[PDB]
Design a protein around this nucleic acid. Structure first.
Ligand SMILES: [K+]
Ligand SMILES: [K+]
Ligand SMILES: [K+]
Ligand SMILES: [K+]
Ligand SMILES: [K+]
Ligand SMILES: [K+]
Ligand SMILES: [K+]
Ligand SMILES: [K+]
Ligand SMILES: [Mg+2]
Ligand SMILES: [Mg+2]
Ligand SMILES: [Mg+2]
Ligand SMILES: [Mg+2]
Ligand SMILES: [Mg+2]
Ligand SMILES: [Mg+2]
Ligand SMILES: [Mg+2]
Ligand SMILES: [Mg+2]
Ligand SMILES: [Mg+2]
Ligand SMILES: [Mg+2]
Ligand SMILES: [Mg+2]
Ligand SMILES: [Mg+2]
Ligand SMILES: [Mg+2]
Ligand SMILES: [Mg+2]
Ligand SMILES: [Mg+2]
Ligand SMILES: [Mg+2]
Ligand SMILES: [Mg+2]
Ligand SMILES: [Mg+2]
Ligand SMILES: [Mg+2]
Ligand SMILES: [Mg+2]
Ligand SMILES: [Mg+2]
Ligand SMILES: [Mg+2]
Ligand SMILES: [Mg+2]
Lengths: 49, 66, 467, 64, 102, 53, 237, 154, 123
RNA sequence: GAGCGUUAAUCAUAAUGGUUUAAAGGAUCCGUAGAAUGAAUUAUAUAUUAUAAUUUAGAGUUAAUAAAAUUAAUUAAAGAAUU
RNA sequence: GGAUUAAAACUAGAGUAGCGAAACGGAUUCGAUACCCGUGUAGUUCUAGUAGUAAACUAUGAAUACAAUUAUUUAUAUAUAUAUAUAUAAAUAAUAAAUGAAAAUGAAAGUAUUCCACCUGAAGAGUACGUUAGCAAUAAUGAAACUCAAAACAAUAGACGG
RNA sequence: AAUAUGAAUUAAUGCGAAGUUGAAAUACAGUUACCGUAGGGGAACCUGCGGUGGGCUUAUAAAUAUCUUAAAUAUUCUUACA
């Protein structure tokens, strides 16, 4: 519709992707000394030595 | 004559009478006013206005208009 | 399932709003007002809509016979005051949106345009009249006031005998009906177009678009709309004679010339003590008769608003009308008879005037209370997409016939120029018909200029003096 | 010939368009009888006076 | 002549245009796609400023008529988003462009 | 859009329709029958000029 | 001929020249055309009424609107073949303008053939200036002729003084005869009175005709003689 | 009838080429739904019920007595010397009907040629029929509906 | 063609190059014995004495093979290896004998394109 | 490039085709199958299909009124001329 | 699948003026198994059959929906101040748009939908072989190898034309 | 009986060079060509019968013309008159 608002979040839903701002934020928490760096969801595989 | 009709003019026609098509003067007036404003604008802007008419007798009108 | 009260349609880049209550003469209720108010906000945000066209589907019978006040009267009789205040908040908020709308709005006043209808057109710089136009403000006979911002518009747009809002007070206090060409010559209508040409004009309005990198809200596009309408204007009827003669214009300008603290009695005194021509004297008696068959309270309230909304900004004038309307439906001090009079005339068909009881002279404090917001009843106008206020219409002057104050300004300026030349009536006509770009060739412009000079200017030698 | 040259040269054109004439070949058509000298001279006269008023308004703005 | 260009790099959508015996099938392409088209069409796209384009020519492959047909297709067979929006009274949004907007 | 596309004939409307249609067929049959008799009458008037003996 | 595109888009083609830089200077017409856009739809438009007689175009009478029997005595119970043919073409064909006055005009000149011999000027002066009161036949500004009768007849039927058009027409005809007889006498008498005071005239109408006939009869005499001598020689063969 | 729909799509193309402002189409539920979608999408200026002779000015109830004489009247739009409704073609043809799941409709709107159907182009309208209702393909995808891909309008 | 005609077989003809060496039986080359060496005249507008040879292949097919290069030592009963490739100006000569294979020696004193004429590299 | 060439092969390289005049409308029509195609409204269902009811715009039947004297088959006649 | 299907041809029985393959003669010609002339058999005709072929052509399968004009006839209907006028169809002609390699098509060779037939370089070839049908002549069906880089249509400018 | 092979024997056809006997076709090609069919002839071809245009739509005259204020008035006219 001529007066319907369509923004980045709506576009993200149409393209079935996380918002571009979210992608930027997730890419900033990758540095080893950066905030948000987390890796624990994989510690669920039984191992025997 | 209705026999010489160029049907692309259909929207300007008011009707047919005595074997000819009658032009809708209400539209002629609106088109004439629009055309007149264009001539006035170009004249007021300093443009070159050329009046072309090659039917017999038109020269007098054409010369005075220029 | 039922036919919608207001119909919305697309006309190329123009959006057509059509009032669709033929059986009620397109009377405006809360539903209609709310629908139009909401749809206009959307069109303001849209980048594909260049202009809006407000018309009726009942033309030439009526465009809008006025707000639906008969229903508001029943609310008052049932103490449904919340319903009544909703009806006026919607209507007045729509009148404020139209006044401040940034895109051109073109109203086709093809029929009875009385009351709310005036509010739908008076606030648009492109208010087109036709032979079938019948402009009137018949509120004094129903016990109400001149609403829909008519106390801010009429004192600023009328052309003749309106230096001190004299003509504005004459129309609001007498409820005189103006017809077609007369409405255009008075300034009530910006343009005069034959009804037969409305179809063609509508199509042309939809086809025109802002050029290059200009939005439809630019002054450039407003000029384009004005030119398009002018191409459809036709010369006035040969026999047509203006409704008000100079003598009748002299009675209004003198008998309705009050001060900042004037009263309806002062007008009654002038109409009762007027001296001059026999026609003028007889004309003053006719006004006196009419003004004595109105609501004694409504006349005083109308005068108050005209003297208050003639120097205020648009938002404060429209807000003051909402307060007055609410302070009248809820008659706390039994000072008005709006509800009882409305039932006597509309709900019940009675030709005779309602016998008035509140025949006193309200004080300045009483009038202030009736036109001031009560701290217990909070009412505010709905927010529009423009949210702007101003003391002068931004476009009305450019595209209507000039007022008597604009002609005077040019005579005074020309008469006080270093040229040391003489101002001549012929030079005045030329300056208004063939000089101003937006007024070039404007219908009935030379006739109006001659009415002003023949009644306001003194011709001495080859010059003109502003009596 | 003249109309097609005007199109090629991007020159706006005005013309009287009779019922047997093609409207789209001109920028601003004027529907009307093109065979009578009275009709033509009437329409030409109106356009000529419109031009005159434009010229007079340009010469006036130069003076003042 | 001026030819409409979407994002000044490609055409608006796809074009199936017939110029005399030449059948032109032109498709718009993503940024960085390059010109993958008939050699005659390639040269025209270079001069016009088209960077991304795919297409195939069927039936006649006469160079002269491909060039003229291409020019005609770029002008008579394209419609800008703005022209479509105004004609239909609708808003047309480029989803890819909105996704990277503020 | 909400209006139904078709409204079926009410049983009463179908009765009046059948009356008119039966009348139309009957009137045409009667008018043809009377025309034939009027031709038989005009042939009787002239059969005195015809020879069978 | 194809609907042309390049005549109405001169502004847009010019704007591309200016934006690119191919054209350095804005043309004088450029601003004027931008403010006054050309009409570019060139569509065929339907029409729903004949402006002359107010006949409605595009209306189909449904069988529900014809409940009574027809002239044949039969009821209509189903649409006929004509009702089932799409009639869109009638919406676009220029309507034939008709006028009741045209029928009377043909009648008047059939009844009075010699009124045709009175020259009529078709060149108009100003149609908008005609202020005629058709309560009387004579009008200042126009001749007395057949049209005076027709307009008088219409005024009578419009004022409802007469009901039948024939009666109004006959009433107008007699008013016309009276005025024509007063003018035939004013001219005869004026000529008679002038001759009685010594007015002299070079050539009368009868004399003018004799002179013209002589010019023709003189050329005819020569040719006849010539062609009556070639025949004699050719026949001698 | 898909045949009737094919006739209507061709008819609209013919009328656009000559630039007639008003034309008529057969009076059926499918035609009405088809026209209504075009009207809401801005391809048609107006949509009125009427007769063989023209649009109705006042409401005329449709019954078996006049059903054979009913028509739908549609107004065509033209802007800037170009028709708004330039082309109108069927996707699902009478002799080859195409039913797609919602997953394949999403691919069609994403640039993927499905079952030889060229993908949706910018500014194009593709209509889908599901349970005898006609809707835009994007609306069918929103409602998770599977349906027949009827036609594409540009 | 209609949709049903396509269902019944109608369709575009397939494009695939056809074999021009049918006598080899889809083999790169076949051994043969020269039956008779011959000299043939090109078709116009060419003029030359083109050396050819009739050969009986190990599969029983008898073919005419062109002997390329300047000078050859092929005789009757010589063992030759035949490959595909026609002599354009000689109609009916659709094959070539391989120089430097069997009893056919490489071109004497060939300097350029030696591999095409069975000539070994000079030290 | 430790490969290069050549021969033998496979895939790709235009039906996002055509049939007055270039390859290509069957002499013509009738009509069977068609796992060919095909009206309208409503209600269900398991749904572009099925079923049921209802409808008359395609396709038919019978009359009435007007019009026309051709096309088949058969029989009975006439005419100018020729030998 | 069925039926009908020009001319020629064939099987029987009639007919046979004129025309007329062939044949035999007369001319023409360097020659003249021709064109022209004569005599003129089959055939051309009728009845009962066989056969199913033609540039059997609009070199254009059938059906349906739809799109801008004019002219001219025809048909039906309507009206009247009675002989025209107004309507709605059909046909034909010239066109717009559209289509097309163009010539052009023009209500289709346009916009669409449905069904059938048919085509896939030239030549070989509508031939060979087989099969089916027929008294027969034949008709239908219908290849491949070898060879070649051709071959064809519309249009353009010339040259030429007894 | 089928399939394959060779085969006495026998039929059709292509290309290549290259003359010979005629001059059939393309122009009115010097007898309009071609289609179907029949007969005849060194060879092309000739002849009969019907069909087709992919040949004649290439289509282009038995000629004959008239009266109202010729001007002190129309012809001039520059936003004037009204
Ligand atoms: K073709
Ligand atoms: K069959
Ligand atoms: K015989
Ligand atoms: K033929
Ligand atoms: K068929
Ligand atoms: K020959
Ligand atoms: K033959
Ligand atoms: K023959
Ligand atoms: Mg003309
Ligand atoms: Mg390696
Ligand atoms: Mg492929
Ligand atoms: Mg075909
Ligand atoms: Mg055929
Ligand atoms: Mg054939
Ligand atoms: Mg029927
Ligand atoms: Mg026999
Ligand atoms: Mg002979
Ligand atoms: Mg048979
Ligand atoms: Mg044969
Ligand atoms: Mg055949
Ligand atoms: Mg035939
Ligand atoms: Mg049939
Ligand atoms: Mg055979
Ligand atoms: Mg050719
Ligand atoms: Mg010869
Ligand atoms: Mg020859
Ligand atoms: Mg010959
Ligand atoms: Mg012979
Ligand atoms: Mg012959
Ligand atoms: Mg020839
Ligand atoms: Mg020819």
């Amino acid at each position: 519709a001529e007066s319907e608002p369509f923004g980045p979040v709506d576009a993200a839903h149409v393209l079935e992707l996380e918002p571009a701002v979210e992608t930027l934020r997730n890419l900033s928490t990758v540095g080893e000394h950066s905030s948000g760096h987390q890796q624990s969801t994989n510690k669920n595989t039984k191992v025997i030595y | 004559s209705t026999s010489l009709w160029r049907s692309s003019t259909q929207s300007y026609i008011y009707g047919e009478y005595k074997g000819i098509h009658i032009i809708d003067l209400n539209q002629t007036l609106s088109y004439l006013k629009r055309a007149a404003k264009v001539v006035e604008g170009v004249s007021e802007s300093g443009g070159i206005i050329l009046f072309l008419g090659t039917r017999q007798g038109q020269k007098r009108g054409l010369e005075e208009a220029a | 399932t039922d036919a919608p009260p207001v119909l919305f349609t697309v006309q190329d880049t123009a959006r057509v709003i059509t009032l669709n209550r033929p059986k009620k003469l397109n009377a405006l209720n809360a539903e209609m007002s709310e629908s139009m108010f909401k749809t206009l906000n959307e069109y303001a945000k849209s980048d594909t809509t260049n202009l809006v066209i407000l018309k009726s589907s009942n033309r030439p019978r009526s465009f809008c016979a006025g707000g639906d006040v008969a229903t508001v009267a029943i609310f008052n009789f049932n103490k449904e005051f919340a319903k009544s205040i909703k009806f006026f908040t919607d209507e007045y908020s729509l009148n404020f949106q139209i006044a401040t709308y940034l895109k051109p709005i073109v109203t086709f006043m093809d029929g009875i345009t009385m009351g709310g209808g005036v509010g739908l057109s008076i606030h648009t710089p492109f208010r087109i009249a036709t032979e079938n136009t019948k402009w009137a403000m018949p509120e004094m006979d129903i016990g109400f006031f001149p609403d829909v911002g008519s106390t801010f518009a009429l004192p600023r747009i009328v052309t003749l005998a309106n230096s001190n809002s004299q003509m504005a007070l004459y129309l609001c206090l007498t409820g005189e009906v103006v017809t077609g060409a007369d409405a255009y010559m008075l300034g009530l209508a910006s343009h005069y177009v034959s009804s037969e040409n409305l179809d063609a004009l509508q199509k042309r309005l939809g086809e025109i678009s802002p050029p290059f990198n200009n939005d439809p809200q630019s002054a450039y596009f407003f000029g384009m709309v004005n030119e398009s309408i002018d191409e459809f204007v036709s010369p006035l009827p040969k026999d047509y004679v203006f409704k008000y003669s100079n003598e009748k214009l002299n009675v209004i300008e003198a008998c309705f010339n009050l001060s900042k603290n004037g009263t309806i009695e002062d007008i009654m005194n002038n109409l009762r003590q007027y001296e001059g021509s026999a026609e003028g004297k007889a004309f003053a008696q006719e006004i006196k008769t009419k003004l004595l068959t109105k609501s004694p309270s409504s006349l005083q309230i109308a005068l108050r608003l005209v003297q208050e909304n003639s120097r205020d900004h648009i938002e404060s004038a429209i807000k003051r009308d909402l307060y007055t309307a609410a302070n009248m439906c809820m008659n706390q001090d039994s000072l008005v008879e709006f509800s009882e009079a409305t039932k006597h005339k509309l709900i019940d068909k009675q030709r005779v005037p309602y016998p008035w009881t509140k025949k006193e002279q309200l004080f300045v404090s009483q009038l202030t209370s009736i036109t001031s917001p009560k701290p217990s009843l909070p009412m505010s106008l709905l927010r529009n997409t423009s949210n702007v206020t101003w003391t002068q219409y931004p476009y009305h002057s450019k595209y209507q016939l000039p007022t008597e104050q604009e002609i005077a300004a040019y005579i005074e300026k020309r008469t006080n120029d270093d040229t040391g030349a003489k101002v001549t009536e012929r030079e005045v006509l030329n300056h208004f018909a063939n000089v101003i770009p937006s007024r070039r060739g404007k219908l009935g412009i030379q006739s109006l200029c001659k009415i002003v000079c023949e009644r306001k200017c003194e011709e001495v030698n080859d010059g003109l003096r502003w009596k | 010939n003249a109309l097609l040259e005007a199109i090629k040269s991007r020159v706006p054109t005005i013309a009287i368009i009779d019922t047997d004439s093609e409207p789209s070949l001109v920028t601003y058509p004027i529907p009307g009888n093109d065979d009578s000298l009275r009709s033509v001279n009437f329409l030409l006269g109106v356009l000529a006076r419109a031009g005159q008023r434009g010229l007079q308004n340009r010469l006036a703005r130069n003076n003042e | 002549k001026e030819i409409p260009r979407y994002e000044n790099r490609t055409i608006y959508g796809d074009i199936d245009f017939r110029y005399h015996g030449v059948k032109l099938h032109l498709r718009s392409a993503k940024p960085g796609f390059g010109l993958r088209v008939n050699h005659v069409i390639f040269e025209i796209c270079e001069c016009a400023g088209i960077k991304d384009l795919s297409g195939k020519v069927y039936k006649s492959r006469n160079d002269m008529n491909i060039a003229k047909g291409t020019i005609e297709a770029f002008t008579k067979a394209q419609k800008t988003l703005d022209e479509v929006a105004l004609g239909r009274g609708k808003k047309l949004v480029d989803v890819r462009k909105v996704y990277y907007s503020s | 859009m909400s209006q139904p596309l078709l409204r079926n004939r009410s049983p009463e409307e179908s009765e009046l329709l059948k009356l008119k249609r039966n009348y139309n067929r009957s009137l045409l049959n009667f008018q043809a029958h009377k025309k034939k008799l009027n031709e038989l009458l005009n042939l009787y008037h002239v059969a005195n000029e015809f020879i069978v003996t | 001929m194809k609907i042309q595109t390049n005549a109405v888009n001169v502004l847009q083609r010019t704007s591309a020249y200016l934006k690119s830089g191919l054209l350095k200077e804005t043309p004088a017409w450029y601003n004027v055309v931008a403010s006054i856009p050309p009409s570019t739809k060139f569509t065929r438009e339907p029409r729903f009424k004949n402006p002359s007689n107010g006949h409605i175009i595009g209306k189909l009478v449904d069988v529900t609107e014809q409940p009574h029997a027809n002239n044949k005595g039969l009821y209509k119970t189903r649409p006929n073949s004509s009702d089932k043919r799409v009639g869109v073409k009638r919406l676009y064909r220029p309507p034939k303008l008709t006028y009741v006055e045209d029928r009377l005009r043909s009648l008047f000149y059939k009844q009075h053939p010699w009124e045709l011999s009175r020259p009529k000027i078709l060149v108009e002066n100003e149609i908008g200036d005609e202020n005629y009161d058709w309560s009387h036949m004579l009008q200042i500004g126009r001749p007395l002729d057949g049209e005076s009768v027709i307009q008088r007849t219409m005024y009578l039927i419009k004022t409802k003084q007469y009901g039948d058009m024939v009666e109004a027409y006959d009433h107008a005809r007699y008013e016309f005869y009276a005025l024509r007889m007063q003018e035939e006498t004013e001219q005869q008498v004026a000529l008679e009175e002038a001759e009685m005071f010594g007015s002299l005239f070079g050539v009368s109408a009868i004399e003018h005709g004799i002179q013209k006939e002589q010019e023709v009869l003189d050329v005819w005499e020569k040719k006849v003689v010539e062609e009556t001598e070639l025949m004699a020689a050719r026949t001698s063969n | 009838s898909l045949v009737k729909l094919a006739n209507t799509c061709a008819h609209l193309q013919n009328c656009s080429k000559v630039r007639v402002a008003l034309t008529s189409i057969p009076y059926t539920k499918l035609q009405l739904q088809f026209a209504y979608n075009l009207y809401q999408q801005g391809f048609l200026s107006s949509l009125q019920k009427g007769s063989t002779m023209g649009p109705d000015k006042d409401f005329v109830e449709v019954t078996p007595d006049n059903i054979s004489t009913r028509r739908l009247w549609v107004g065509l739009k033209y802007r800037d010397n170009k028709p708004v409704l330039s082309s109108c073609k069927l996707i699902s043809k009478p002799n080859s009907r195409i039913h797609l799941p919602m997953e394949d409709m999403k691919k069609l709107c994403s640039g993927v040629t499905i079952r030889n159907i060229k993908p949706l182009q910018p500014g194009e309208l593709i209509l889908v029929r599901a349970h005898n209702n006609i809707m835009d393909i994007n609306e069918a995808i929103s409602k998770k509906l599977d349906g027949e891909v009827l036609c594409r309008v540009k | 063609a209609t949709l049903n005609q396509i269902k019944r077989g109608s369709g575009p003809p397939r494009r695939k190059k056809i074999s021009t060496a049918p006598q080899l039986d889809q083999c790169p080359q076949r051994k043969g014995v020269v039956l008779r060496v011959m000299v043939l005249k090109p078709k116009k507008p060419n003029s030359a004495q083109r050396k050819a040879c009739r050969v009986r292949l190990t599969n029983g097919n008898v073919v005419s093979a062109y002997i390329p290069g300047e000078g050859h030592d092929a005789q009757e009963h010589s063992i030759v290896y035949v490959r595909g490739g026609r002599c354009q100006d000689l109609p009916g000569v659709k094959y070539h004998v391989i120089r430097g294979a069997g009893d056919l020696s490489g071109v004497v004193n060939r300097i350029s394109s030696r591999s095409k004429y069975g000539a070994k590299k000079p030290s």
